Each structure stands twice: as C-alpha cells, then as structure tokens.
Design a protein around this ligand. Structure first.
Ligand code: 5RF
Length: 447
C-alpha cells in the first residue's frame, strides 16, 4: 500500500489533466476572442463578424469533444497491445504537441493551431478516461479497489477548478498569459513522464495479455506490499475465467440482436441526459453566462461553481451506496430542472431587480450541485450493471460515443441557441431535463 500510492498518484495526473483541459476555456473566453478578431484584421483588413466569431470560438471548445470520441474508441487498441503503463507514458506525446500548438498559437497568429491543439488534447483526454480507470483497478487490492477508483472523478472536478482558478485576471486569464494558461499542461505531463517509468506495469497485463505467471507476482509483492500473493494471483486467474467464459460481443452485435436493444436504449439515453442537461453549458460558459447576468467578478462565480462541484462530488460518494440509483437520478434531474427555471427567473427579473444576479449564482450553484449527485455518476453505475463481462466492453464504447456526441452538441450549439432564446436558454435544458425525468420514471429499472 506504500508503493501503491505512487502507481495511482502518477496515473491520476492524467485525470487531473482531463479536468483541466475541460474547463480552461471558461474564464479566458473574452481575451481569446479578442485575439481571433485581432488576427482576422491583420490578415484581411477587416473586423471579424460576430456570428462568425461565435461559431469559430464554439468550434475551438467543441472540437475537443470530437477528439475525446476518437480517443475513447482507441483505448482498447493501445491498452491490450502496448500495456497500461506504457500507454499513458507515450500518450504524453499528444499533451506536449498540444501544449506547443496552443502555447505558440498567439505568436503564430493562428487560431488553426489552437483549434488543432484543442483537438489533439481531446484525443489524449478520450484515451485517458479509459487508461486511468482501468489501470487503478488492475493495481489496487480488492478491498481498497472501490475507494481508489474514485480518484479519477476527483481528478476531473479538481482539474476543472484549478483551470478556473488560474483563469483569473490576477494570474493567467488575461491578454498576456492565456497562451501559457493553455500550455501549462506540460508540467503535469513532464511530471507523469518522470513518475510512470518507475511505476509498475499492470499485473493483469502480465498474467493474461502476456502470459507471465511468475513476472506478475514480482509486481504484487512490491505493489501489494505483502510478501506472498498466492490468493490474489488466483483471484486474477478466476476472473480471467469469468471475463473470457462468454464471448465478448461487439458493437455491431449489440444493435442487431433484440436481446440488447432495450438495455442499450437506457444506456444511450442516460448518456444524453448527462450532457443535454447542460452542465457543460456551465463548465464551458460559466463566466459568459454570469456576465450576461449582472454578476460582478464573474470568474469568481465560475470558481464557485467549480468549488460547489468539487464539494458535492465528495458528498455523492457517501450517498451512492447509501441510497438507490433510480432515486438519486430522478432527484438530480428534478434539482437541475428547478435551477434551470430559477436561472430563467433570475435572468428575466434581473433587468428590473438589480440583485437577481445573485440568484443566478444560487441557481447555477444548485444546477451543478444536483448534477454531481444525479446525472453525473449514475449513468456509469447502470451501464456497467446492465451487461455481463461479454457485452459490457461494447456498451462502454457506445456510451462513450453517446457521451462525446451529446457533449459536442451542447458545447458547439449552446452559443448558437443563446443568441436566439435569450434568457430562455435554460428552458431547453428544463424541457430536456423533464423528458429525461419521464424516461427514467417508467422505462429505466433499478439495481
Ligand atoms: C465506467 O468507467 C468510467 C467511470 C467514470 C468515468 C468518468 C467520466 O469521464 N465521466 C463523464 C463526464 C463527467 C462525469 C462526472 C462529472 C462530470 C463529468 Br464532465 C465522461 O465524459 N465520460 C467520457 C469521457 C467517457 C465515457 C465512456 C467511455 C469513455 C469516456 C468514465 C468511465
């Protein structure tokens, strides 16, 4: 358990980087848009059109989701061929390439570099959410396996928060240091590049994927700390039997047979309910929505949503196992549906009452606080509980595609919907939050 901390802590760095890159583009939105118009003038002697500047910057945040899709498609490619440890170590290449492309984007007067960098890091982030959850599971003892598996989620939320903190005007969220705000990912990457070579390879990769019965226990004896591991070594050979007993079905065989078309419908929808609820409307445009209200120091209100999100993440841990899963998901959608309304109330009466800007903060704070106990974790505590070791890997891949797709719809189209709906944007979220509430109250079972 001593050497165990190093093997995990070096893997979580990717999940911290996952959370970072997700929420870096929140506070420094205004300053990077000023760079886009400044580049547009220098090239063509012309101020950029606002509708074009919108779809252009929306593409700069949304393309990251497209990368995540490809990445989560390719997790199995590198995992089973190159290993778990060696995969996370080489994929730091993308992080550096992306840091260079985004850091030197301003110096080259190229928004293409920034977009291209935002994409490459998206690939890294789509792969990371397959490497890290898998590596920590194939490392920790069965007892500590449930607890240490949480550090991935915490890495996402804390990473978002650090990005929003560094997004202040005092620090890096300004006209001078926004290229460094995007590029600072090289530090965690360089740290993980130093740590991982000293971390142990996944025993399950040595035992199964490479048939090294004796080299495996050479790891667990230093990893588990215990001298012998005769029982754990056989625990792996017991689930290797249970994982490979039934044929692992493919994505194609999942849609075809009508034995899986009802569980998958639940899986996909619950993924759409995580994204089309509209939390990445906050975690991407928090500082923009708050400014559209009457918020003073709007970047701090985003850090508030970041802190609130971190808080209720920890609370959720002691509630998921302490209560049901149908209930915590219905409560979540209902809470978000109320805050989405409370937002519209706080956004409509603000023009008359110069203090509803405070209510908008209370609203979004509850909007993300309820998400973290409902449509955040539950969609993963059901898909895995709807498929055995055979068709489960195929369900993750579809849910991954379903998650990145829906996440791309929000991140890309939210600013196109905001110019038309005005204060009635969160109505769409409120509508969808109801459809997802109806669907779960009837067509979704309990586990
Ligand atoms: C079952 O294995 C897991 C467990 C947890 C996770 C965590 C995660 O990435 N969850 C959401 C996003 C999210 C969760 C909780 C709070 C805020 C947010 Br934003 C996600 O985007 N997953 C994507 C990256 C994914 C889905 C399926 C397969 C690969 C990647 C991923 C796979």
């Amino acid at each position: 358990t001593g050497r165990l901390m190093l093997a995990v802590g070096g893997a979580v760095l990717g999940s911290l980087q996952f959370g970072y890159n997700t929420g870096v583009i929140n506070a420094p939105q205004k300053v990077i848009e000023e760079f886009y118009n400044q580049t547009w003038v220098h090239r063509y002697g012309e101020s950029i059109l606002p509708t074009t500047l919108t779809t252009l910057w929306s593409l700069s945040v949304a393309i990251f989701s497209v990368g995540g899709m490809i990445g989560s498609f390719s997790v199995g490619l590198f995992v089973n061929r190159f290993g778990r440890r060696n995969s996370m170590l080489m994929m730091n290449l993308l992080a550096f390439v992306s840091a260079v492309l985004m850091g030197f984007s301003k110096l080259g007067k190229s928004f293409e570099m920034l977009i291209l960098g935002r994409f490459i890091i998206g690939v890294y982030c789509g792969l990371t959410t397959g490497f890290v959850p898998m590596y920590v599971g194939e490392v920790s003892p069965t007892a500590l396996r449930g607890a240490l598996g949480t550090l991935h989620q915490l890495g996402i939320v804390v990473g978002i928060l650090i990005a929003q903190v560094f997004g202040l005007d005092s620090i890096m969220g300004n006209k001078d240091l926004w290229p460094l705000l995007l590029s600072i990912i090289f530090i965690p990457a360089l740290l993980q590049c130093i740590v991982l070579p000293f971390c142990p390879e996944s025993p399950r990769f040595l035992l199964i994927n490479r048939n090294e019965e004796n080299r495996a226990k050479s790891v667990l004896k230093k990893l588990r700390g215990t001298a012998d591991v005769t029982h754990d070594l056989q625990e792996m050979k017991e689930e290797s039997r249970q994982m490979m007993r039934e044929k692992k079905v493919t994505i194609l065989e999942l849609f075809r047979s009508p034995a899986y078309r009802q569980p998958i419908l639940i899986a996909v929808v619950l993924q759409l309910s995580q994204q089309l609820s509209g939390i990445n409307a906050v975690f991407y445009y928090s500082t923009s929505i708050f400014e559209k209200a009457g918020v003073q120091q709007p970047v701090y209100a985003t850090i508030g949503s970041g802190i609130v999100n971190t808080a209720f993440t920890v609370v959720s841990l002691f509630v998921v196992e302490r209560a049901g899963r149908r209930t915590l998901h219905l409560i979540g959608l209902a809470g978000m549906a109320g805050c989405a309304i409370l937002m519209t109330i706080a956004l409509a009466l603000l023009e008359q009452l110069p203090w509803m800007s405070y209510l908008s903060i209370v609203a979004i704070f509850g909007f993300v606080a309820f998400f973290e106990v409902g449509p955040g974790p539950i969609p993963w505590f059901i898909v895995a509980e709807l498929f055995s070791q055979g068709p489960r890997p195929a369900a993750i891949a579809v849910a991954g595609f379903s998650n990145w797709t829906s996440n791309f719809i929000v991140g890309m189209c939210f600013q196109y919907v905001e110019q038309l709906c005005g204060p009635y944007v969160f109505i769409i979220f409120t509508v969808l939050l109801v459809l997802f509430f109806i669907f779960t109250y009837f067509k979704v079972p309990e586990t």
